[model samples]
Every structure is written in structure tokens, then in C-alpha cells.
Target: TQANWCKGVRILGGKRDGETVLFTDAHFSESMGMAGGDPELVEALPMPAALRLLVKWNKLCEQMKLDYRYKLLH
Candidate 1:
């Protein structure tokens, strides 16, 4: 199984804290944080997929007024 965009991919997962908690980082592992929380490993995303995910996430955050100053900052 060879992939062209496999290098330095970001890890994705959810850590439940009474609700869905999303986390992502290149060096993240299922055992890295909040012992006994049983972090759920999601998927390893390539850089392009990660970038698009963030862009969509930002769009939703802006639309809901969770980040109203995003446009002003950029």
C-alpha cells in the first residue's frame, strides 16, 4: 500500500468529554492525553485533505459567529 501523499500526515481523533471532542496533530497518538479517556483514533489525513478540512471548519465557525473577526484578521 503506497501513497504519494503519505509523508508527515496529520492524525485525527475524538476524545469524549461528555461530548464529541475533535483533535488533530502530526505527532498525536491514542495514549498521548487525558489518561483513561480512551481517545478514539479517526484517520490519518494528507496535507491537502487537512487543509481543506480546516478551510471548511473555518467557514462554519465564521457563519455561526463563533469567529466573527476572521475576515478582519485576514
Candidate 2:
């Protein structure tokens, strides 16, 4: 409908008549990574817990090669 991706999927204003229903549209870049906007959240995670997530991410990457999670680069 002349729009792609998270390109503002506002509800068609026909049935509602002059109403807005767009809620959320989140899009992030690869350089931004998973928690790109929140470093402190990851930092706040303990080494043990963080290691678990990292391991899971690595395991999946090794198999599927996805960009869902990234290695810490600090």
C-alpha cells in the first residue's frame, strides 16, 4: 500500500473516521546491534547471566548466521 517495513502502519481512517491508530514502529541498524540504545542494561547484567545470553547467541549464530545478537564490543 505504498509503504514498506515499519513505515508508519497507521490504520486506514475510513471506519473510524478521522482517527489515528498507529502505535509503534521500531527499526534498528546492524551497527546499532541488539541493545545498541541501552548499554547500561547489558552492563547491569552480571557476568554469569550475560555469559549465558552470549553463549546462546553464539550457538545460534554458528548454526543460523543471524544478526539478531552481537558480541560485546566494549
lDDT winner = 1
Candidate with top TM-score is 1
- List candidate 2 stretches off by more than 4 Å: 1-43, 67-69
Q: What is the TM-score of each candidate against the true structure?
A: 0.36, 0.34
Candidate 2 collision pairs: none
List the RMSD of every prediction in angstroms: 12.3, 16.1
Cα miss at 29, model 2 (Å)? 25
lDDT of each: 0.36, 0.34
* Cand. 2 Cα-lDDT: 0.34
The per-residue C-alpha lDDT of model 1 at residue 49 equals 46
TM-score, candidate number 2: 0.34
